[PDB]
């Protein structure tokens, strides 16, 4: 759900 | 013949996978699943035993930050629970000095930890040590000259290019030279007396840039960039080479495994994981 982890 | 172990990770939800790669024959081994799925965890080895530290279980129906420590024995193919940490630590950084595991920063809900704790396998106990000068989640951790370095991360407001160093004998932290690039979720390791910081996220883009810290000159220098931009990648060192595993490129959950040769200053694709994932824990035994 974020650009750093893809979560 | 040592293997590269990859534990947990993320693709749609947190994963339970434990797989081992043999760089000699290019084969992948499917090992016993983690008891609890996790991503944002860190991996390490002490006395031939693999440890999976912290992270978070992201499921479609809810999230659970982890304070857990689990031990895998390659001889028995069995996971055994250990004493949990004082606090849950998602996006943790881990380092080993004298057979002791250091759990660095990470998050618990709204809390961005600066706290650091140490595990003694012979006593099955965790104890808090001096906290970092900066709150760091998505922190890269490396052990060099019996010192523990905490590189980059996110303090809760900004992503960092700063780095600090822990002195175990003195029980204190000191700031060191900041990196050239702001990096959170980067791959941090030690190779030939140097600290390497590969990929991560700068606030706008996933990175393919790689920089190296030299202790003698106290400077960070860019080396050859990776072929793929990646954040929340796994990293390790095997037979004088750096291995980067998966991560997120801004579009895809990578299955790509790149290898860095310091003699030629070149990256090459060596293998692919069985499936794409980010936020894995990695170690060699």
From Swiss-Prot, chain A:
Changing residue 5 to K: In IMDDHH; increased protein abundance; increased positive regulation of transcription of target genes; changed cell redox homeostasis. Widely expressed. Highest expression in adult muscle, kidney, lung, liver and in fetal muscle. It comes from the Eukaryota. Ubiquitinated in the cytoplasm by the BCR(KEAP1) E3 ubiquitin ligase complex leading to its degradation. In response to oxidative stress, electrophile metabolites, such as sulforaphane, modify KEAP1, leading to inhibit activity of the BCR(KEAP1) complex, promoting NFE2L2/NRF2 nuclear accumulation and activity. In response to autophagy, the BCR(KEAP1) complex is inactivated. Phosphorylated by EIF2AK3/PERK following unfolded protein response (UPR), promoting dissociation from its cytoplasmic inhibitor KEAP1, followed by its translocation into the nucleus. It is found in: Cytoplasm, Cytosol; Nucleus. A motif (ETGE motif) lies at residues 4-7. Induction: Down-regulated by ENC1 via a proteasomal ubiquitin-independent protein catabolic process. Heterodimer; heterodimerizes with small Maf proteins. Interacts (via the bZIP domain) with MAFG and MAFK; required for binding to antioxidant response elements (AREs) on DNA. Interacts with KEAP1; the interaction is direct and promotes ubiquitination by the BCR(KEAP1) E3 ubiquitin ligase complex. Forms a ternary complex with PGAM5 and KEAP1. Interacts with EEF1D at heat shock promoter elements (HSE). Interacts via its leucine-zipper domain with the coiled-coil domain of PMF1. Interacts with CHD6; involved in activation of the transcription. Belongs to the bZIP family. CNC subfamily. It is linked to Immunodeficiency, developmental delay, and hypohomocysteinemia: An early onset multisystem disorder characterized by immunodeficiency, recurrent infections, developmental delay, poor growth, intellectual disability, and hypohomocysteinemia. Some patients manifest congenital cardiac defects. IMDDHH inheritance pattern is autosomal dominant. The ETGE motif, and to a lower extent the DLG motif, mediate interaction with KEAP1. Transcription factor that plays a key role in the response to oxidative stress: binds to antioxidant response (ARE) elements present in the promoter region of many cytoprotective genes, such as phase 2 detoxifying enzymes, and promotes their expression, thereby neutralizing reactive electrophiles. In normal conditions, ubiquitinated and degraded in the cytoplasm by the BCR(KEAP1) complex. This is Nuclear factor erythroid 2-related factor 2. It comes from Homo sapiens. The chain holds residues 76 to 82 of 605 of the full protein.
Curated annotation (Swiss-Prot), chain B:
Disulfide bonds: none annotated. It comes from the Eukaryota. Changing residue 154 to A: Abolishes repression of NFE2L2/NRF2-dependent gene expression. Broadly expressed, with highest levels in skeletal muscle. Changing residue 40 to C: In a lung adenocarcinoma cell line; also in NSCLC cell lines; strongly reduces interaction with NFE2L2/NRF2 and reduces repression of NFE2L2/NRF2-dependent gene expression. Changing residue 9 to C: In a NSCLC cell line; strongly reduces interaction with NFE2L2/NRF2 and reduces repression of NFE2L2/NRF2-dependent gene expression. It is found in: Cytoplasm; Nucleus. The modification S-cGMP-cysteine is found at residue 110. Component of the BCR(KEAP1) E3 ubiquitin ligase complex, at least composed of 2 molecules of CUL3, 2 molecules of KEAP1, and RBX1. Interacts with NFE2L2/NRF2; the interaction is direct. Forms a ternary complex with NFE2L2/NRF2 and PGAM5. Interacts with (phosphorylated) SQSTM1/p62; the interaction is direct and inactivates the BCR(KEAP1) complex by sequestering it in inclusion bodies, promoting its degradation. Interacts with NFE2L1. Interacts with BPTF and PTMA. Interacts with MAP1LC3B. Interacts indirectly with ENC1. Interacts with SESN1 and SESN2. Interacts with HSP90AA1 and HSP90AB1. (Microbial infection) Interacts with ebolavirus protein VP24; this interaction activates transcription factor NFE2L2/NRF2 by blocking its interaction with KEAP1. This is Kelch-like ECH-associated protein 1. The gene is KEAP1.
């Amino acid at each position: 759900g974020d650009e750093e982890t893809g979560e | 013949g040592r293997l590269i172990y990859t534990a947990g990770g993320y693709f749609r939800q947190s994963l339970s996978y434990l797989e081992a790669y043999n760089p000699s024959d290019g084969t992948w081994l499917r090992l016993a699943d983690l008891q609890v799925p996790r991503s944002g965890l860190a991996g390490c080895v002490v006395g031939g035993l693999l440890y999976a530290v912290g992270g978070r279980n992201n499921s479609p129906d809810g999230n659970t930050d982890s304070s857990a420590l689990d031990c895998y024995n390659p001889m028995t193919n069995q996971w055994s629970p250990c004493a949990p940490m004082s606090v849950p630590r998602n996006r943790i950084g881990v380092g080993v000095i004298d057979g002791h595991i250091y759990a660095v920063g990470g998050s618990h809900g709204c809390i961005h930890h600066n706290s650091v704790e140490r595990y003694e396998p012979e006593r099955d106990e965790w104890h808090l040590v001096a906290p970092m000068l900066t709150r760091r989640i998505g922190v890269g951790v490396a052990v060099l000259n019996r010192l523990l370095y905490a590189v980059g991360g996110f303090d809760g407001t900004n992503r960092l290019n700063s780095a600090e160093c822990y002195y175990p004998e003195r029980n204190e932290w000191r700031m060191i030279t900041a990196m050239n690039t702001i990096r959170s979720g980067a791959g941090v390791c030690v190779l030939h007396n140097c600290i390497y910081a590969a990929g991560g996220y700068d606030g706008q883009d996933q990175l393919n840039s790689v920089e190296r810290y030299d202790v003698a000159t106290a400077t960070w220098t860019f080396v050859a960039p990776m072929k793929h931009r990646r954040s929340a990648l796994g990293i390790t060192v095997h037979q004088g080479r750096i291995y980067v595993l998966g991560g997120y490129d801004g579009h895809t959950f990578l299955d790509s495994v790149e290898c860095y040769d310091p003699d030629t200053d070149t990256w090459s694709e060596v293998t692919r994981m069985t499936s794409g994932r980010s936020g894995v824990g990695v170690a060699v035994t």
